Write a protein that binds this ligand. Sequence first.
Ligand SMILES: *[C@@H]1O[C@H](CO)[C@@H](O)[C@H](O)[C@H]1NC(C)=O
Ligand SMILES: *[C@@H]1O[C@H](CO)[C@@H](O)[C@H](O)[C@H]1NC(C)=O
Ligand SMILES: *[C@@H]1O[C@H](CO)[C@@H](O)[C@H](O)[C@H]1NC(C)=O
Ligand SMILES: *[C@@H]1O[C@H](CO)[C@@H](O)[C@H](O)[C@H]1NC(C)=O
Ligand SMILES: *[C@@H]1O[C@H](CO)[C@@H](O)[C@H](O)[C@H]1NC(C)=O
Lengths: 117, 117, 117, 117, 117
Amino acid sequence: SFELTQPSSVSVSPGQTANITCSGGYLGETYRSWYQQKPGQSPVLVIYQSSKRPSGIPGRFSGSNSGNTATLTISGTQPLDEADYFCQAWDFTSVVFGGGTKLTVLGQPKAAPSVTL
Amino acid sequence: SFELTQPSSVSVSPGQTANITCSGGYLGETYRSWYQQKPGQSPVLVIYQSSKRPSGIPGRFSGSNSGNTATLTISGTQPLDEADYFCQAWDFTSVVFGGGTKLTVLGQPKAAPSVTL
Amino acid sequence: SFELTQPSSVSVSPGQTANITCSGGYLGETYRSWYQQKPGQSPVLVIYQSSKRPSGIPGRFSGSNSGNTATLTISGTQPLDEADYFCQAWDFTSVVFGGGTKLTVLGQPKAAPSVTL
Amino acid sequence: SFELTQPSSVSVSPGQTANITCSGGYLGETYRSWYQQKPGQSPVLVIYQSSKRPSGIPGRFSGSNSGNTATLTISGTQPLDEADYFCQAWDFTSVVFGGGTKLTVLGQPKAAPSVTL
Amino acid sequence: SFELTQPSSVSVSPGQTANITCSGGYLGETYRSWYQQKPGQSPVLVIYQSSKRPSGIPGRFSGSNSGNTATLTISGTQPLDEADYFCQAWDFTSVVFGGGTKLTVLGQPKAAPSVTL
Ligand SMILES: *[C@@H]1O[C@H](CO)[C@@H](O)[C@H](O)[C@H]1NC(C)=O
Ligand SMILES: *[C@@H]1O[C@H](CO)[C@@H](O)[C@H](O)[C@H]1NC(C)=O
Ligand SMILES: *[C@@H]1O[C@H](CO)[C@@H](O)[C@H](O)[C@H]1NC(C)=O
Ligand SMILES: *[C@@H]1O[C@H](CO)[C@@H](O)[C@H](O)[C@H]1NC(C)=O
Ligand SMILES: *[C@@H]1O[C@H](CO)[C@@H](O)[C@H](O)[C@H]1NC(C)=O
């Protein structure tokens, strides 16, 4: 008995494994005594945007593009009292193969073995 | 008895496994004594946008594009009292193969073995 | 007895497995004593948008596009009292193959083995 | 006895499995004593939009497009008292093959083995 | 009995494994006694943007681009009282193969061994 084996393998198989975890902990409070006197509370916030004849990517192609043109983002800016943000903003971006990618697996093997017994 | 095997494998099979978890913890409160006096509460917020003759991507193609033109985003900005945000904003973006991708697996093997016994 | 096997496999089979979980925890409150005096509560919010002759993607094709033209998004901005957001906004975007993708599996094998016993 | 087998397999079969779960936890309250005095409550909110001669995607095709033209979204902005949002907004978008995709499996094998015993 | 094996392997399979974890710790408070007197609270914030005839990437292609054009980002700037940010902003960007990448695996082996016994 004989064993002849030729597993020709042209394979592309990348892969990622991830463990993600958050615990807010222990928030314990005993005998918290409070006397609060705050009359006449008057907070102010003004947000303004104006734009005229803008343009973006006015030319030839981009293979991949995550970037922006003139924009405005506002987050958690003016918290006044007892404001909690716990594990608040979790942003995960995972890409195996990006945009505009060419995979051309051009496999044309020739294999002619023999066994004489 | 003989064994001849040639599992020619032209295969593309990438893959991701993920564990995601959040626990708000323990929020315990005993004998919290409070006396609050806050007459005449007058908070203010003004948000304004104006735009005229804008344009975006006025040209040739983009393989892939997540970016924006002039926009405005407002989040959790003016919390006044007892405001909690726990594991609030979770954004996951997972792509195996992006846009505008070409996979051309052109497999034309030739294989003629033999066994003489 | 002999064994000859050639499982020629031109296969594309990527795949993702995910575990997602949230627990709000333990929110326990004992002997919480409160005396609240808040007459004359007058909060204000104004949101304004105006747009004139805008345009977007006024050209050749996009393979894939998630981006926007001038828009406005407002979230959880002005919470006044006892406002809770727990595991509130969960956004998952999963794509195996994006838009404008070409898979051309052009498999034309030739295989003529033989066994002489 | 002999075994000859050639399972030529040109197959595309990607697939995703997902576990999704939320538990609001334990919300326990004992001996909560409250005396609330809030006469003359007058909250205000104004939301305004105007648009004139807008246009979107005024050109050649898009393979796939999830993006918008000038719009406005308002969510959970002005909660005044005892407002709870638990696992409130869950948005899942899962695509195996996007729009404008071409799968051309052009399989024309030739296979003529033989066994002489 | 003899063993002949030639597993010719032209394979590209990179992969990353990650452990991510946060614990807010222990936040314990006993006999916290407070007397607060803060009448006439008047905070102010003004945010302004104006833009005219801007442009971005007005030329030939970019293989990959994450960069922006003139934008403005505001975060956690003006917290007034009792403001907590715990494991607040977690941003992970993982790419195996970037955009505009060419993988051309052009495998054309020739292999004709033999065994005479
Ligand atoms: C971490 O992930 C591995 C697999 O990568 C798994 O065996 C283990 O259970 C995970 N541990 C935790 C604490 O999530
Ligand atoms: C982590 O994921 C692995 C598989 O990747 C699984 O065995 C395990 O149960 C998971 N553990 C937790 C704590 O989620
Ligand atoms: C995690 O997922 C694996 C499969 O990926 C499964 O065996 C296990 O039950 C899951 N565990 C939890 C805690 O969800
Ligand atoms: C997780 O999913 C696996 C299959 O993916 C299943 O065996 C298991 O029951 C699930 N566990 C939970 C806790 O949902
Ligand atoms: C760390 O990850 C390894 C696999 O990379 C796993 O065995 C282990 O459980 C993880 N440990 C923790 C504490 O997450």
